Design a protein around this ligand. Structure first.
Ligand code: BTM
Ligand code: MG
Ligand code: MG
Ligand code: MG
Length: 340
């Protein structure tokens, strides 16, 4: 049973889960990859990797992805969680020099991953491998957009480093803006395209209904994460969380903050349902009888279908993943799967 404070009956009833048929193989291949790239210790991979459900999350999201594309996304995603863990540990241990250097290396590797496939920092080498593979599906223009988006993500993580080091809790609106970057909204939105096999023209992916649907899917996932990961984050002195900003700057109690975050998450669902109709109408309109129109139509339809799947995959992931099971840890401040 999902804890009452985290339960969303509309998701449970109206957003039926989907699972990509490649999932079983994906689970094993990503685990093997984490080991080969030395991203986590062998004993921790054995005990925790599968229980973290990182592949499950992506396999419930990018439905219809060619297996090769799904593999690359899952590897990159598992890398992304490990980076989030490294970032946290660097901050906790006050390793400002190590963080700055990693930051600079990621910016560099992002632009030229091939050159960094065997970097001494296994986190950098892991990054380079997944990004090189991601860069092999679509034209260079998509690769450039992914890079542009991720350069922005890296810098948001830097901003987080300095907030936490300096003991600052962002204001609510400052936070909401930053969160679109720390959650990598536009990266996941970018990845819809290789998943449906088509780089969408700016005029298509920037259609207002496509844009708004894409945004709301991510706002849901990010804010729902905030809601579910709040106890783990409070315990680990993370300050980045919609609820923490509300508690700190709106004088809300924990109870009130949880309530407000819930409300905002719920509004996301019903706002998405409305714009979803417009985005699907757009997909229909693209199908104008031409070969190109049919291609674009089917790709928009698939992408919007996956925007919808993010809701259920992200929802269930927070209840299945070991990542958030802080009640199960002896030291609530130090998750067992992180390198401390
Ligand atoms: C570190 C977590 N993550 C994904 C790697 C960073 C963007 C956000 C996320 C959390 C939970 C579900 C989905 C995404
Ligand atoms: Mg985190
Ligand atoms: Mg984070
Ligand atoms: Mg969180």
């Amino acid at each position: 049973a999902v804890p009452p404070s985290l339960r969303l009956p509309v998701i449970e009833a109206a957003f039926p889960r989907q699972l990509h048929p490649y999932w079983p193989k994906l689970q094993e291949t990503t685990r093997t990859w984490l080991l080969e790239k030395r991203l986590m210790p062998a004993d921790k991979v054995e005990e925790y990797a599968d229980g973290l459900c990182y592949t499950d999350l992506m396999a419930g999201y990018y439905l219809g992805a060619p297996d090769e594309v799904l593999q690359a996304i899952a590897d990159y995603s598992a890398w992304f969680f490990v980076w989030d863990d490294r970032h946290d540990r660097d901050i906790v241990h006050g390793r400002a020099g190590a963080w700055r250097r990693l930051r600079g290396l990621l910016h560099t590797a992002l632009d030229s991953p091939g050159d960094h496939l065997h970097h001494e920092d296994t986190l950098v080498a892991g990054f380079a491998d997944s990004v090189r593979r991601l860069y092999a599906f679509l034209p260079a223009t998509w690769n450039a957009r992914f890079a542009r988006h991720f350069h922005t993500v890296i810098e948001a993580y830097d901003r987080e480093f300095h907030n936490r080091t300096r003991g600052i809790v962002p204001g609510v609106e400052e936070y909401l803006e930053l969160r679109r970057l720390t959650f990598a909204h536009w990266i996941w939105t970018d990845l819809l395209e290789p998943s449906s096999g088509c780089e969408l023209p700016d005029a298509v992916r920037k259609h207002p209904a496509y844009r708004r649907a894409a945004l709301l899917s991510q706002e849901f996932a990010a804010w729902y994460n905030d809601l579910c990961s709040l106890p783990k984050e409070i315990a680990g002195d993370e300050v980045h969380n919609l609820g923490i900003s509300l508690i700190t700057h709106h004088s809300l109690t924990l109870e009130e903050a949880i309530g407000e975050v819930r409300r905002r998450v719920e509004e996301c669902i019903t706002e998405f349902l409305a714009v979803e109709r417009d985005a699907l109408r757009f997909a229909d309109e693209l199908a104008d009888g031409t070969v190109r129109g049919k291609e674009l139509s089917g790709a928009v339809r698939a992408n919007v279908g996956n925007m919808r799947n993010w809701f259920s995959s992200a929802y269930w992931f927070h209840h299945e993943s070991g990542r958030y099971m802080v009640d199960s840890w002896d030291d609530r401040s130090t998750p067992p799967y992180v390198n401390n």
